[PDB]
Design a protein around this ligand. Sequence first.
Ligand SMILES: [Mg+2]
Length: 565
Amino acid sequence: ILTLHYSTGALDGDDAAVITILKRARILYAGNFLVLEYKIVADNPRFYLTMIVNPDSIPNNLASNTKIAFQIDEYDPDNNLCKVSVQQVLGNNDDPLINIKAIMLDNSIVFETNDVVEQHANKLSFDTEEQHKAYRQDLTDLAFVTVDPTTSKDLADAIYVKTIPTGFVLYVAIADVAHYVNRNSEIDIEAKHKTSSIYLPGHYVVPMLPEQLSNQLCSLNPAQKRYVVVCEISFDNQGRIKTNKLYPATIISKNRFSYDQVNKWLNNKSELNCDETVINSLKAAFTLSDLIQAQRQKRGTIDLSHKETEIVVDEHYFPIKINFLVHDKAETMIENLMVVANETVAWVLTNNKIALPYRVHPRPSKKKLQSLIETVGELNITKPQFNLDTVTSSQIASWLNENKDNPSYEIFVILLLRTLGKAFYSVNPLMHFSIGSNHYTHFTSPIRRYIDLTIHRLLWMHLFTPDQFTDNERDQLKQELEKIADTVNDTEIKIINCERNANDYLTTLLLSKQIGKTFSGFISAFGIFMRMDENNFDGLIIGDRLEAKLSEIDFIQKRAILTLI
RNA sequence: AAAAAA
Ligand SMILES: [Mg+2]
């Protein structure tokens, strides 16, 4: 497969020369239509072919500067000519939301509503008798709550924590999505294709499941009875796990909190209008969370936190400003409880000899570490003493920790993450090196990740109600696990590229209003990249500090051009 | 290109 000598019409993802194309990476391409003589300028700057537009594919009244998608029906290798045909009209080429949808199309990400799938979803309802199953514990009396970003309408997890003399009991209640979505149903097939929900700025979301499930029937909304799968974990007073149980349950969330509300309550800047049972559960949750964090740091875990930003857009999808995100205390509390549930479920399935898709992150090779050691040692970052074949999560963490004061610590973490590589899903039991566990999976987010849905299905079919499934049903799912992991892994790459394309588009749209401003920053990486302090975005012209002026936006390549003072 | 909620 080919990545973009310059002189046989092959494209990205389809010394040597290309002889033939076995399979195109794409069938549709986004572009701007211009007008009589017709032209298309592809959105992707790596689309280098000259295009002859078929007039019979163009509605007669379709005007210039309209975003379209086109396909190649045939091509001619002797003249570097290609024929293209218009397949979709998307809208005005200057509209930022239209550009975001074009970016999705260019990354092969479905975003248009599937009328067949929504009609199936509108047929679903709340079965009142499910709560009376002998296997489903009625927990509707417990003061569960949800803590999420203010704008989310998909809330998959609720928590309740009780203090006991010997320690703590944690209840992590996860929406019972497998109860509503039958395997190989129309809804399931569409979810498996998407593999996850998509979150773009302005809270524009492409949901893995349609809204009546993701935001209503499975969303653990306040004051609603909801069916869940509970991970219940008992801890000692040091935060060490003693026992665990998994089981289906029924809950009623008592409150829907935002991270912002909980964090301000933490700093005594405000108060929560809720029952004292909720207050006491939150207090125990934070106490338990600090203990869990201390235990995980003791056993080994790599904090790869670094600068992150989000782009705020208005109601018409025009960008307003860039915010630096603050993974604060309340967000940290939720993450600690979700990780311990995820880790526990991984071990339960493993202990029971049930094949599952793990979330894995292998130890990096000695060679890659050596290359990294060479690159960074040049940059006032200590040289580590550990053995490179045997290096533990703790040793990487200690190396980062003893450099927390280096002025270039930010760029250090970036290169280590690449050296470490991408996490992925695998049925083979590989470690998660940065989390610090030998077994890990994704269990807590089945409304928005297909892997979590699969994990719930495995629990139901093997542990909760094995009698309602056949050995051929269990083997049918087992045989598919590696293909599910592959599809999710392949699609995750596309989703990451789509968000990156979209953030570059919106950030440069915002910066195009700011030719006239000077910026400070350092170098992140044909030329010098400079990352501006105010927006965390790299302009084009490692670790040196610089100051520079914004001279132009390159809209072809979606890049910011800077000039040295 | 890690984790978590989205
Ligand atoms: Mg949540």
